[PDB]
Amino acid sequence: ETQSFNFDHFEENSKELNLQRQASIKSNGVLELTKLTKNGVPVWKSTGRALYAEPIKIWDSTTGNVASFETRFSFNITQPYAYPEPADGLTFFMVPPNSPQGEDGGNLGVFKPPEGDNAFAVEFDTFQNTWDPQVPHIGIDVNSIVSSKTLHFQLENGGVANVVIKYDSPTKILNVVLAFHSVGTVYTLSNIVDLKQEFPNSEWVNVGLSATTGYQKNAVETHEIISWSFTSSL
C-alpha cells in the first residue's frame, strides 16, 4: 500500500535513520552530513549519507504498476569562504538495496565513474566540475552525474532552503521545487523519468540524502538537514 516516514527533527539511535561515514546527528536535532573539522584539525574530502532504514517499493512486477512519491526536506548550506571555491554539494538519491557506495567529491557520494549501480539522484551542485553548467544548480541525475537537466539558482548562504520533490507515476513527471522563503525566491525544474526503466532489476530501493566536501583544503561547506518527510503511493 502506502509508505511514509517523517522527521520533524532528528534523534540519535533512532533505528529509522541509517547513518554512513561522516553523517551524524548534532545535539540540535539537526542531521549533519559532512564535517568541517575532525579531531581538532581542519578537514576536507568529507563524505556522509543518511539512508532510511526501510526500503521503498518503487514498482510491482505482478501488476506492472509504478509508485508515485513525494519527499520534502529543509537544508542549510553554509560556505565559510570564497577562495578556494566551495564544494561539492548535496543530493537526494535512490539505489537498489545493498548497492555499493559512490565516490567522493564531484560524485556527491552517489555515483561511481564506471557505470556500476543503477542510481537516481536530485543534486544541489555547489562546485562546477568539467561536466557541470554554471553553479550552483539543481540537477536531475538519472544514472549519471551528468544531469539530464539543470537549473541555476542563487544560494542563500546559511539560509534555510525548502525542497519539494514530486513524482507522478501516471504521467512519468519528476518535478523539483526549491524555495527560500525568507528572501522569497522559487526555483522549479521538471523532466521525464521512467522509474521502471531506470531501475529494471529492483522493485525496491533505498531512499537517502548525501553530501560531500572538496578535494582541496578549504574547498568545503556545511551540509545540514533540518527536517525530512517522504511518502510513496504504489
Ligand X SMILES: CO[C@H]1O[C@H](CO)[C@H](O)[C@H](O)[C@H]1O
Ligand Y SMILES: *[C@@H]1O[C@H](CO)[C@@H](O[C@@H]2O[C@H](CO)[C@@H](O[C@H]3O[C@H](CO)[C@@H](O)[C@H](O)[C@@H]3O)[C@H](O)[C@H]2NC(C)=O)[C@H](O)[C@H]1NC(C)=O
Ligand Z SMILES: *[C@@H]1O[C@H](CO)[C@@H](O[C@@H]2O[C@H](CO)[C@@H](OC3O[C@H](CO)[C@@H](O)[C@H](O)[C@@H]3O)[C@H](O)[C@H]2NC(C)=O)[C@H](O)[C@H]1NC(C)=O
- With CB under 6 A as the rule, give the number of residues binding ligand Z: 7
Q: Longest Cα pair distance anywhere in the chain, in angstroms? A: 55
Nearest to 47 by CA among 94, 106, 100: 106
| Nearer Cβ to ligand Y (80/200) | 80
Let me know the angle formed at the C-alpha of 32 by 193 and 27, rounded to the nearest 5 degrees.
140
Residue numbers at the binding site for Mn ion (CB under 5 A): 125, 132, 139
Torsion of CA 95, 99, 101, 103, to 10 degrees: -70
Please identify, among the stretches 20-28, 161-169, 177-185, 211-219, the one whose residues bind ligand X according to the rule CB under 6 A: 211-219
Residue in this structure with the C-alpha cell 532504514, named with its chain if needed? 53
Q: What is the DSSP string of 157-181?
A: TT-EEEEEEEEETTTTEEEEEEEET
Range 192-221, binding a second copy (CB under 8 A)? 192
Residue 132 partner contact from ligand Z, ligand X, Mn ion, none using kind-dependent CB cut-offs of 5 to 8 Å: Mn ion
Which of ligand Y, ligand Z, a second copy, none does residue 39 bind to, with CB < 5 to 8 Å depending on kind? Answer: none
What secondary structure does DSSP assign to 60-104, as a single string?
A: -TTT--B-EEEEEEEEEEE---SSS---EEEEEEEE-TT-----S
Size of the site for a second copy (CB under 8 A): 17
Binding of ligand X at residue 188 (CB under 6 A)? no
CA distance 32 to 229: 17
Binding-site string for ligand Z from residue 143 to residue 162, where x marks contact by CB under 6 A and - marks none: ---------------x-x--
- Per CB under 8 A, the list member of 14, 37, 157, 188 interacting with a second copy is 188
Q: For the window 95-114, what string marks contact with Ca ion as x by the rule CB under 5 A?
A: -----------x--------
Task: At 144, list the grid cell.
Answer: 549519471
Decide which of Ca ion, ligand Y, Mn ion, none touches 139; Cβ closer than 5 to 8 Å per partner kind.
Mn ion
Q: Residue 70 has which C-alpha cell?
A: 513525494
Minimum distance between the CB of residue 225 and a second copy, rounded to whole angstroms? 17
d(CA 203, CA 159): 37
Closer to ligand Y by Cβ: residue 9 or 152: 9
Residues binding ligand Y (CB under 6 A)? 76, 78, 80, 158, 160, 222, 224
> Least distance (Å) from Mn ion to the CB of residue 143?
14
Residues contributing to the site for ligand Z (CB under 6 A):
76, 78, 80, 158, 160, 222, 224
